Design a protein around this ligand. Structure first.
Ligand code: CL
Ligand code: CL
Length: 162
């Protein structure tokens, strides 16, 4: 298992514009297009992202290209963040994947806000961290995905995804 396979399982793959769990226009492998309520605005963002007049539909290859860029962007956002970087540096490879996953879904800002859980991760207090991560809107809104991510973060294994 790896970050890509992990996220592909959590986000799924859709080739036509759809609405995510929060109601936002998305496409491909969890690629958020816009928070705006307008389909047209979403269509324009899509075209801009792909570089062609899309008609709201993309190909599998296009979906994977956006996904690569998005994963790269997530890692880079962690390394550029003063709060996240140190955490990431302190973890093993499986746990690092869990932090990338969270940033991918909620953004750097969102994640940087889990102040207390981050401090526990840094201290390697796994169970305490896992309880703390669960006390969140994140957990309450998308519990199954959160459980999978939290288990990974906590145990350092891929058992939640096998
Ligand atoms: Cl983009
Ligand atoms: Cl869920």
């Amino acid at each position: 298992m790896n970050i890509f396979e992990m996220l592909r399982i959590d986000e799924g793959l859709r080739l036509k514009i759809y609405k995510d769990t929060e109601g936002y226009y998305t496409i491909g492998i969890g690629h958020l297009l816009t928070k705006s309520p307008s389909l047209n605005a979403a269509k324009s963002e899509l075209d801009k992202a792909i570089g062609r007049n899309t008609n709201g539909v993309i190909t599998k290859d296009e979906a994977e290209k956006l996904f690569n860029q998005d994963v790269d962007a997530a890692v880079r956002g962690i390394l550029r963040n003063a709060k996240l970087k140190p955490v990431y540096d302190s973890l093993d490879a499986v746990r690092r994947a869990a932090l990338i996953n969270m940033v991918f879904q909620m953004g750097e800002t969102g994640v940087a806000g889990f102040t207390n859980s981050l401090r526990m991760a840094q201290q390697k207090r796994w169970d305490e961290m896992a309880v703390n991560l669960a006390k969140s809107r994140w957990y309450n809104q998308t519990p199954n995905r959160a459980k999978r991510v939290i288990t990974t973060f906590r145990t350092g294994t891929w058992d939640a995804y096998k």
